[PDB]
């Protein structure tokens, strides 16, 4: 499979993400009641491994990352450069695996025995004849043999701008795998001008539930290569991406005392396990 | 109702135990009666509700705060009002009302106070 | 005058009465939370157990729930009596 | 326990409003689940790599399965076989495999055996029904059949609800085979001996395991039972998507997120529900819990008594007076105040005064 | 008991021990309250 | 700790029972607090 050249090797940048990605634990609605639910959560002030998908010089990295229960992905994008995800065990096209595209139509999904290349991506080119970004090489996979589940999510829209700028938006997701069900949670946050995860409290709202048996050891992310006229003009060297940044934090079983507002939005939550003080609150 | 719920099937199983249900109800009823008894003893020590004189000649003692106010509802004294403010059938469990209302208790307390000064 | 100020400023003076209010509220709450517990049964809700189980089999599950609920109530009544007796002593001291 | 009663108020016979009508609401899906197709299949996966199918979003009637009674064994755990239709479950699964009649007992919760502990082990908390029935004619041919295999050896016990499709030759300790498969070295697979000549006792049985979980999320594995028009503001029995509760139903103020399907109070009891067909949100309350207290002057004195319901709102009950303590009947109240002969609570006292009431 | 018995068989066995022991605690806790209440009345007399 | 003992398996069954485990501890603590109060009332009769 086609490769990419001149990558920069550096130790992983670290940051502290605090009180982020608390996701409505279940379906019940409750008003003005404090409830404690023993459901996997990102530990508060948990260590987060930051990542870079930015050229800056000759910098581009999107390697495989280990996956445990806590697969909290928090990308930050402006011109929508990070798009999809890959799940699975060994990505051998022999064990059942998960895969998505984030198109303007849907977060299109699939459960198929796909044969992925060593360097999958999404490709967009700037044409001189017409100012629109089209797919150039959608060779993410070879084929699919057996597919026990196929699926399309709810419709939404994406901007797809070809410019440079600070990340005007935020996207958080929590991937989980429990009792034969694959699940996902999301929120769009209009955070302004913060390099690190924003101070504050926001609660993820479940988007989709899929019943699947697939067992997945690790996962990968999809990038959008910003192919232009200035580039050499090939699949190995012809690319000038731009800014991308994404952070992955694992999830471990913890007990959260979650405050419920009158309407029911979880306005605030305190982690019992994390601090000596915090443990008192649960008992209290 | 609490132990077996609405279902009649479940209630029959409870009958085998026999005197448990009845015993529990009786004890709680007795406790409620006893609770009602306490208020009567503590507050109802006077046969007659004495009423304070209109005259304010109390030899320079101002009892306005302790005594009832005609402007405010329930005839509760200003000191009493503060105390009331500070303190702050769901599923087969019912909290019976007290035998004596809060307003009625205030009159007994007011009467004792009125009696003491006069 | 000072006493009026003291009463409006701190809740310490009315603390004892509230303990009674809170303690009673907590006792009632525990009994209600008791119903949710399975007590070794297949499911906590009584109706659910009856709906999905045939009468002989339904019997064992129903029994467990009855036994657990009886224990819950016993604790409350027993707990309540001790508190009632304690309050009774205070009233005897208090009336006098 | 006396034929004479002293003056006072006694509490007896607590009353709860009865449910006038029963309403059942189900999701409006008419596509029959294909249980039949799964039951009849040309090929059933062997124990080593059992076939599992997830059936959801459709309506299955279990009467035919229970009704048909053409199957040798129909063991059911945690669910009444007769009562299957009324219950509604989500996340139903199906397992397909064939094992001999002798080992049919082994495939059950908390049981031992070679295949159960080495090929497929049911969880202790399983709540599903297992079906077995011989297909001797299908498992008998001129040349025989040996594509059905069961594992003999494995280093460690197979986990519950997990399957082994891996193929690797058996080993114990040292003298590793590396494909050698002589003595102490074995191939993972082991075939069967299903033959027409072979006896019934060890003859092939076709076994399907039906497993489902309930009360987690809105699920659509609901039975064939027909729905009814919603009833509001009246105490009536109700069932929503396999969930049963009885209380007054009223339009609910509280807002609901798209993901949420249930509402709860401080005591973690059902407070609100959404009719699936309608899309509306409603509040459930118990009709009334009633303490009935009888007030009587005495048996010596009189044979007339006044009955009071503490919970009552004076309309709930199916002369009449309204008191803060409770709805009161059989007593005509008087404006002036008298010493309390009997204490009714909430500053009300009832006495016999005389012409006589 | 746990070493000797597997989880399906162990639950019923372990459950019996749990039930019995719970009774011992409740009886002890109930007894303490009764004694404590007696001491509290008693202590107040001493205080008085 | 008393009922279930050290073993984790024993603990799980106790969780099923409810807040009995938690409730019993609360009652004892209330009793423990009361002891201090009694002594305080009886002997702290003097400011200095
Ligand atoms: C899914 O596809 C795989 C191929 O990727 C199938 O595996 C083959 O199945 C045949 C028939 O049993 C065997 O002869 C081959 O040896 C298998 N492949 C290999 C590489 O060994 C598999 O059967 C398919 N499964 C389903 C459920 O359709
Ligand atoms: C995060 O990881 C680093 C290692 O790079 C470590 O030194 C640090 O202790 C971790 N931070 C926290 C808050 O645990
Ligand atoms: C999941 O995948 C790993 C290899 O990544 C394998 O060892 C493991 O047994 C798999 N388990 C299940 C239980 O599906
Ligand atoms: C959500 O809560 C707010 C603040 O309590 C209150 O106005 C209302 O209950 C809800 N309102 C809106 C309007 O979003
Ligand atoms: C009693 O106190 C009140 C409140 O301070 C005051 O208004 C009143 O003048 C005082 N005394 C008399 C005799 O009015
Ligand atoms: C079935 O349910 C949907 C969604 O609630 C509704 O739009 C539709 O009209 C229903 N159909 C009938 C025929 O009852
Ligand atoms: C029930 O509620 C109140 C209670 O005082 C009052 O409006 C009346 O007694 C009843 N009213 C109804 C049911 O509209």
Numbering used by the authors:
A (entry chain A): 15 to 70, 76 to 303
B (entry chain A): 740 to 827, 854 to 883
C (entry chain A): 932 to 1027
D (entry chain C): 304 to 621, 641 to 676, 689 to 691
E (entry chain B): 980 to 1027
F (entry chain B): 740 to 787
Article passage:
To investigate this possibility further, we determined the cryo-EM structures of both the [S:A222V + S:D614G] and the S:D614G S proteins. Overall, the structures for the two mutants are strikingly similar (RMSD of 1.332 Å over 3193 Cα atoms), especially at the level of the S2 region, although we can observe small conformational changes in the position of the NTDs and RBDs.
The sample, under the conditions indicated in Methods, presented a majority conformation 1-up with about 50% of the particles (after consensus), although two minority but stable 2-up (1.6%) and 3-down (1.9%) conformations were also found through symmetry relaxation. The highest resolution structure of the consensus 1-up type is shown in Fig 4A, together with quality Figs in Fig 4B such as the global FSC curve, the reported resolution (3.4 Å) and the angular coverage. Comparison with the structure of the S:D614G mutant reveals that in the S:A222V mutation the V222 residue is accommodated in a highly hydrophobic environment of the NTD shaped by V36, Y38, F220 and I285. On the other hand, RBDB of [S:A222V + S:D614G] undergoes a rotational movement that also brings it closer to RBDA. All these movements affect the degree of tightening of the S1 region of the spike, so that the global conformation of the [S:A222V + S:D614G] mutant seems to be tighter than that of S:D614G. In this direction, the distance between residues 114 and 381, located in NTDB and RBDB at the interface between these domains and the RBDA, are 3.5 Å closer in the [S:A222V + S:D614G] structure (35.3 Å in [S:A222V + S:D614G] vs. 38.8 Å in S:D614G). In conclusion, the S:A222V mutation at the NTD of the SARS-CoV-2 spike sequence is able to produce small but noticeable allosteric effects in the RBD that translate into changes in its conformational dynamics as well as biophysical properties.
